[PDB]
Amino acid sequence: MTEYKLVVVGAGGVGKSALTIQLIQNHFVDEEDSYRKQVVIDGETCLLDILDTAGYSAMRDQYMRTGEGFLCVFAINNTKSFEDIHHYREQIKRVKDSEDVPMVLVGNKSDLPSRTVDTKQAQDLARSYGIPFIETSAKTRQRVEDAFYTLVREIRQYRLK
Numbered sequence: 831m832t833e834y835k836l837v838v839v840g841a842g843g844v845g846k847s848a849l850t851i852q853l854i855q856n857h858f859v860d861e862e863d864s865y866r867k868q869v870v871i872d873g874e875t876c877l878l879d880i881l882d883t884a885g886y887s888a889m890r891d892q893y894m895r896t897g898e899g900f901l902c903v904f905a906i907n908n909t910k911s912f913e914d915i916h917h918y919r920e921q922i923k924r925v926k927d928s929e930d931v932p933m934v935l936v937g938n939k940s941d942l943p944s945r946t947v948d949t950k951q952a953q954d955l956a957r958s959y960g961i962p963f964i965e966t967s968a969k970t971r972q973r974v975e976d977a978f979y980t981l982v983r984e985i986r987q988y989r990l991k
């Protein structure tokens with residue numbers, strides 16, 4: 831049965847853990863580990879192996895080398911987290927020595943009114959990076975499945991390249 835190593839990266843407090851737990855338990859966390867889940871996507875069965883990282887170059891480099899797909903998460907109310915997406919993507923590409931790595935840009939906290947990053951701005955960036963963009967709320971569970979499953983789909987597209 832096919833396994834996919836997924837890695838959730840992004841600045842402190844963007845909601846990496848809340849997103850991962852929302853997929854695993856369907857519950858929103860309140861006041862660093864790996865998770866497993868078997869899912870059917872497009873009629874193929876697979877095992878999702880997800881590493882929830884925190885916002886040591888050797889440890890970092892190991893997960894970026896091991897990871898097959900990366901959810902690059904920013905929060906729509908934190909411009910710095912959005913700007914730092916450059917940094918995560920650059921580090922991944924350097925480690926994997928490839929311009930093409932399955933990735934999905936996720937703008938989390940879509941339920942918040944204090945928005946500092948416009949959907950259009952993140953869409954344009956993702957288009958520049960050649961990766962899907964999805965806005966999520968870990969709070970409401972809006973597009974959480976969508977983000978992880980789009981990522982798996984990207985890994986499969988890549989594997990057929």
Ligand SMILES: N[C@H]1CC[C@@H](N2CCCCCN3/C(=N/S(=O)(=O)c4cnc(N5CCNCC5)c(c4)C2=O)Sc2c(Cl)ccc(O)c23)CC1
Nearest residue numbers: 835836837862863864879880881883889892893894896897
């Ligand atoms: N939960 C405790 C035991 C596992 C610890 N841990 C994180 C879980 C590692 C799970 C296996 N793994 C990996 N193992 S690892 O390369 O040796 C590794 C990478 N980062 C880890 N951490 C903890 C340190 N800070 C970064 C995340 C740990 C292990 C690392 O020492 S990589 C990896 C990827 Cl890319 C996807 C899915 C994975 O399951 C995966 C966390 C403390």
Ligand SMILES: Nc1nc2c(ncn2[C@@H]2O[C@H](COP(=O)(O)OP(=O)(O)NP(=O)(O)O)[C@@H](O)[C@H]2O)c(=O)[nH]1
Nearest residue numbers: 841842843844845846847848884885939967968969
């Ligand atoms: N309103 C709202 N709050 C969220 C959302 N996702 C996470 N949060 C909140 O954001 C804060 C940080 O969430 P957490 O999941 O721990 O983020 P993290 O990115 O995993 N943090 P770290 O880098 O330290 O590991 C918490 O208060 C959490 O409840 C969301 O979609 N909406």
Ligand SMILES: [Co+2]
Nearest residue numbers: 857858859860
């Ligand atoms: Co609870």
Ligand SMILES: [Co+2]
Nearest residue numbers: 916917920921
């Ligand atoms: Co740079």
Ligand SMILES: [Mg+2]
Nearest residue numbers: 846847883884
């Ligand atoms: Mg966390």
